[PDB]
Design a protein around this ligand. Structure first.
Ligand SMILES: Nc1ncnc2c1ncn2[C@@H]1O[C@H](COP(=O)(O)OP(=O)(O)OP(=O)(O)O)[C@@H](O)[C@H]1O
Ligand SMILES: Nc1ncnc2c1ncn2[C@@H]1O[C@H](COP(=O)(O)OP(=O)(O)OP(=O)(O)O)[C@@H](O)[C@H]1O
Ligand SMILES: Nc1ncnc2c1ncn2[C@@H]1O[C@H](COP(=O)(O)OP(=O)(O)OP(=O)(O)O)[C@@H](O)[C@H]1O
Ligand SMILES: [K+]
Ligand SMILES: [K+]
Ligand SMILES: [K+]
Ligand SMILES: [Mg+2]
Ligand SMILES: [Mg+2]
Ligand SMILES: [Mg+2]
Lengths: 527, 527, 527
């Protein structure tokens, strides 16, 4: 319904290329070890300093709508690369700009850009097959540290701390990045079942040094329903007092009558009890209670299908731990006495629940449940003096974690853009179906030198000479742009994940080669 | 009541022709195998790349209201062609522009454009009769693959996957296109009675390998009313326990009492039961329940007319299945033991229900029920690396499905615009009533060369020489613009549906010949 | 989504440096004893005159977005230095401007600004280690007075009054600044437990000379619940009348029946009673009541876990005070007769509660409770003839308290910028890893003379000659810019807190060295 402007052919393609060139020229300055940063103004306060390609891409829009179309398409390239792999967005941006420029140069009257796109995709398939052929799996934690160090702009402390976290909680474990109140980065390992639910009554503290509740070899009473009646808590207290053992009551809530009974028996006769609210909101709360029951060797009272009531409690029905810490903010359970076979069965059930899930919010919850049933979670606290420093370093820590996970799942190739450089003879061994497919294959072949050229150009040297000397060298030798040397890349640690490289190439090609099929561009007339 | 501007004659016709010419020049670049794409800016995000004619047409509005009138009329041409046939909108746009231009050139003082319109419609009737005379029915799945390949811009994989879907679910079956999370396209065939309602309680899972409920040779209890009381569910459980067979209960819902009984019997004694909500949101829900009862050999309980009660259930009253799969999001019934004659009677009743409806939404539900009763449905998942490529390919998959259905229902003619080229002697055999009808017949005769000329022009060659060489050749010889040679069109697979060609010609002519009857154009003053 | 402007390299860096330079040039005029003030217009009335660096920094925003980015970054520096330390924001501003300018000058094609940042942070670590080596603890109240005098722009009366406050309530005690209605500053020491709730009924006044209620050796009845009934107040009156001793009833509230009984007993028969509302809203009210019970040797009635009722009150259950003062607005308790070891246990419990707190709102509440239990609080009332004068002097009093607290916790170094000047040989004893780290070390080395140069430049002398003559002198000799001569800084009292100096240096370096890594700046289009 709105009035439209319509452009045809080379003028529209030139304007779209100007937009692509602006966004890629702003992104490409951040590539490699000698890459620089981009300052983006935020409308609500302090500006953001970043070295992340998708962050620079997403934060650029142009007043010219023909240039903004190309900007949005390269934004789609960088965002798809960020979603699929979590790293390699700058590489994807420069590859997409190169494919778009070389495809725009090759459009003539007799050219068929759709067949050029077909040739581009065939060449990308060949290059991805070569990348999977030349990849090797990660088998040492030193390779993990090298991947996390390269992906964090040569920061060996971030690589070492990610390697330590992955040593402790496992290669497929849960690691969460957050900010820190200290100048230095730190790694905290949370083992057992720790959840962020504190006390219900402050009077339950029996360790005034840390203002916390401390028991050893304690009974555990787990309730799916909120414990309200006094008759629902008297037999459990009777068991816990007749056996002379502490009692941790984890429930949905505890009302005033049961709280008054617990606090009276704590402050008057000296009963070792503590009440903790059940973590979670909804079905995940019930799943976490079942996990705690299996880990502690108890049964959950208040079942909505089994109807287990709190008035007939047996000593075998109660779970057992060998240490519990209850703080005002959180509570943890240590060395639960649950049966190992049932714990393994619950772990297998969680793993099989992970196979059918697509919401990507239930997967995180299930992974957290699996981690709490296993060696635990790792928290990386990122240090700095200001919020802008912490955000800039946290983007790099997230990049290193994503690249390390991709290297774990799919292996490693040579870093520095040399992996794409070693795939050129696999395009030289290709027979095109026609001239347009040949044009597309040559477009991809010329594009395969772009990441190494950009990394060398950011280092202040002539990238074409560097790429020529890499291609004249052996297959193990590439260019260390940090030292400015020609080195064995595996022995020097410059390595990339295979997944990141192929994700960047595929996501750049699929959009740029479709952008180079256009003849007419329709925009709205600006108001 | 708004102030108006009024234009007379040749200036108004020139402005409307400028609008028609702009829209047709933006649409015509997408025609043929060597056609290109159009990028349309979307206001909310990523732009849209398309080769579809009606998408380019509908997305163009002009600030000049006199040009916008012609643009809206040729939009109506493309939209009517899309509604009737689902393909051929670019052909319709270029035919409409040709008729409008030739009719605007032929208006003089002594001319009668209404009689010119009469001659145009008479010529179009002659051409449509010739097209139906020269059409051939589709009798091989190879022709199906050829039609779907030509309609999907020469993609052989889309044509092959549509041919496989149409082999499996039938030539009049249900085939639904949707997006895919994988780079490649896939075809999923859903057989039996699968609906979008999963379980009710997660305790019914007896196969945790895929988090699903798995039974073989199960009883089915189907209820049109909600199952809430204990006495509504106890006799059915008694029958299922006495005969020692599983029981799936498909109802409107299951309230807490019956659900508690079902879960308690599932967990404690080990009763093989599962509860599923009835699919649908109204009358279609009851129709689907009746179809399930006929397919499974049972009866629907709680019927509004028959008044069947759940408190007196017989073993013959329950339906039977050979296998039922109940997952979290869907449930399916396989190998129903219903009577074949009643299934055929229900199928015939559904077929006769299709002949007395025109809402185009109940028709889809009736076709889905017919597919679930006889052959199942097919789902084409379209692959790509980004959403823009997925949408661009999904447009062509939809075009190929529409063209294949049109070819099934009405047959095929020659592709490449040669079918319209072979209808010119039929116009040479006509005798006009007067001079204006002769003018209209000549307008249609000159218009009939336009699609082949446009297809050859987009390929980079001179279209007039190509059209002359086609008309000088045999009736089976046309121009392969993809290979750029002169071939047997049927043997090379370059074929079109007759319905698409005649729909495009009729829809272009009816609006453009009425546009060429105008003398005064009234617009609003732009505020 | 908004249209963006993008700038590259030296032009963007020049604009950002222009913003940094304007903000630092407005802040730097306030540095040192001969610094001047800044008048900031306030939109709701009288302007604000200030000598505080963070106040000038926070109150400057620019219409040019590229200059505003640098202004916001130096504002972040000053705000961080204000939050961690409470002083030294002008020093941090000038250090940040120096690091930003020297880093912008050193960027070339072959330069790597990230490694330059690495060298900057390594040099700052060396300088902070040297500062901690050359620091000495505060051991005399004369040093406290000297620190508070230097931090209050040479006002020896503010330094003397802060030294007296820290003599009376301790160096870790609670000291609160507020305005005064008198031209001169004054210090008020509040001992005992004084809270903000006066009487309830005006008939309780037994000393009309000050309109106050005055008892000596009084019983104290504390209630956690609202005393409302006759039975809830009768036996306390019975024992206080049988022992012939006054009664102070501190409760949540007193309803009409109990209040009528108390007023009738006071007016008719002459009962020495007074009712006081319980200070606080929430858990802090209950904690203050427990503090008063431990201090007075009584028990809290109406406990939510102990359930102690007001109908069985014993003489030992009541607390005892040596003197109570009750006025209209406040009430205080003096010489409570509580057991000393329980008071010490409560004090240690409060101290251990202070170990785990992060809200920084409960921390001041716990500190106020600890002050009301150990040694009272100090209030500094700032004098002046107008509100602008009182605000300008209150800023300096707050600066002096913050610097005094930092000197208590972390020690002192030489004032006048000489402490940073004595850390230059510790950078001369550093071996850089490469050329860019050498550049960063030289940037910090040239930056270390900036505060002394600015202090000397504000005094009207040539700062470079002063800094050269300081560095040619002994390690104890600096420049008194107030007297304008070279003196012994420790013997003249010109000393700084170590924490303030290291906080300013670290906060300036961490942000300026990250600002000097930028190559692209993205701002929004000004609407
Ligand atoms: N010392 C080095 N010598 C040569 N190449 C290096 C060196 N360190 C890293 N690289 C290469 O530089 C690239 C990393 O660049 P960078 O991390 O800035 O961008 P990216 O991974 O494409 O995207 P993103 O901006 O999202 O992180 C990789 O190809 C990596 O192999
Ligand atoms: N290889 C070929 N050689 C010659 N003509 C071809 C070839 N492939 C397809 N055609 C012809 O090109 C036309 C298809 O063009 P296209 O599908 O772009 O437009 P359309 O059907 O008019 O509209 P729509 O945009 O809705 O698909 C048909 O007439 C078809 O017969
Ligand atoms: N008489 C003096 N001679 C020399 N230097 C002095 C003298 N008095 C104070 N100084 C120095 O001047 C500096 C104090 O400056 P000023 O208090 O104005 O700013 P600041 O501490 O950087 O920040 P803020 O504006 O937040 O107070 C300190 O370095 C102090 O040692
Ligand atoms: K980057
Ligand atoms: K088309
Ligand atoms: K100052
Ligand atoms: Mg990276
Ligand atoms: Mg088509
Ligand atoms: Mg100061």
């Amino acid at each position: 319904g709105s009035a439209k402007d319509v452009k045809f052919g080379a003028d529209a393609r030139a304007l779209m290329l100007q937009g692509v060139d602006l966004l890629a020229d702003a992104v490409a300055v951040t590539m490699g070890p000698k890459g620089r940063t981009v300052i983006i103004e935020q409308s609500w306060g302090s500006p953001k300093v970043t070295k992340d390609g998708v962050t620079v891409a997403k934060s650029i829009d142009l007043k010219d709508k023909y240039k903004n179309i190309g900007a949005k398409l390269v934004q789609d390239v960088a965002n798809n690369t960020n979603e699929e792999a979590g790293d390699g967005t700058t590489t994807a941006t420069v590859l997409a700009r190169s494919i778009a420029k070389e495809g725009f140069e090759k459009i003539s009257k007799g050219a068929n850009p759709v067949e050029i796109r077909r040739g581009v995709m065939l060449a990308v398939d060949a290059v991805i097959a070569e990348l999977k052929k030349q990849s090797k799996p990660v088998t040492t934690p030193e390779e993990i540290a090298q991947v996390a160090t390269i992906s964090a702009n040569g920061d060996k402390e971030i690589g070492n701390i990610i390697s330590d976290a992955m040593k402790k909680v496992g290669r497929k474990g849960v690691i969460t990045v957050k900010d820190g109140k200290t100048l230095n980065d730190e790694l905290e390992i949370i083992e057992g079942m720790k959840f962020d639910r504190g006390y219900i009554s402050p009077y339950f503290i029996n360790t005034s040094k840390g203002q916390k509740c401390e028991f050893q070899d304690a009974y555990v009473l787990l309730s799916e329903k909120k414990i309200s009646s006094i008759q629902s808590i008297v037999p459990a207290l009777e068991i816990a007092n007749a056996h002379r053992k502490p009692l941790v009551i984890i429930a949905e809530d505890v009302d005033g009558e049961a709280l008054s009974t617990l606090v009276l028996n704590r402050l008057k006769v000296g009963l070792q009890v503590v009440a903790v609210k059940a973590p979670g909101f909804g079905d995940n709360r019930k799943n976490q209670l079942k996990d705690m029951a299996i880990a502690t060797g108890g049964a959950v009272f208040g079942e909505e299908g089994l109807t287990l009531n709190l008035e007939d409690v047996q000593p075998h029905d109660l779970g057992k731990v060998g240490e519990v810490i209850v703080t005002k903010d959180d509570a943890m359970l240590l060395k639960g006495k649950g049966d190992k076979a049932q714990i393994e069965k619950r772990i297998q059930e969680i793993i099989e629940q992970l196979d059918v899930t697509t919401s990507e919010y239930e997967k995180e919850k299930l992974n957290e449940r699996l981690a709490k049933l296993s060696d635990g979670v790792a928290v990386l606290k990122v240090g700095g003096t200001s919020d802008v420093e912490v955000n800039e370093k946290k983007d790099r820590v997230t990049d290193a974690l994503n690249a390390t996970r991709a290297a774990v799942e799919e292996g490693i190739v040579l870093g520095g853009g040399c992996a794409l450089l070693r795939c050129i003879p696999a395009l030289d061994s290709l027979t095109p179906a026609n001239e347009d497919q040949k044009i597309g294959i040559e477009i991809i072949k010329r594009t395969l030198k772009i990441p190494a050229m950009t990394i060398a150009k950011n280092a202040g040297v002539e990238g074409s000479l560097i790429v020529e000397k890499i291609m004249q060298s052996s297959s193990e030798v590439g260019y260390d742009a940090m030292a400015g040397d020609f080195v064995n890349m595996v022995e020097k640690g410059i390595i990339d994940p295979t997944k990141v490289v192929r994700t960047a190439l595929l996501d750049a090609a699929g959009v740029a080669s479709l952008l180079t099929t256009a003849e007419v561009v329709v925009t709205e007339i600006p108001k």
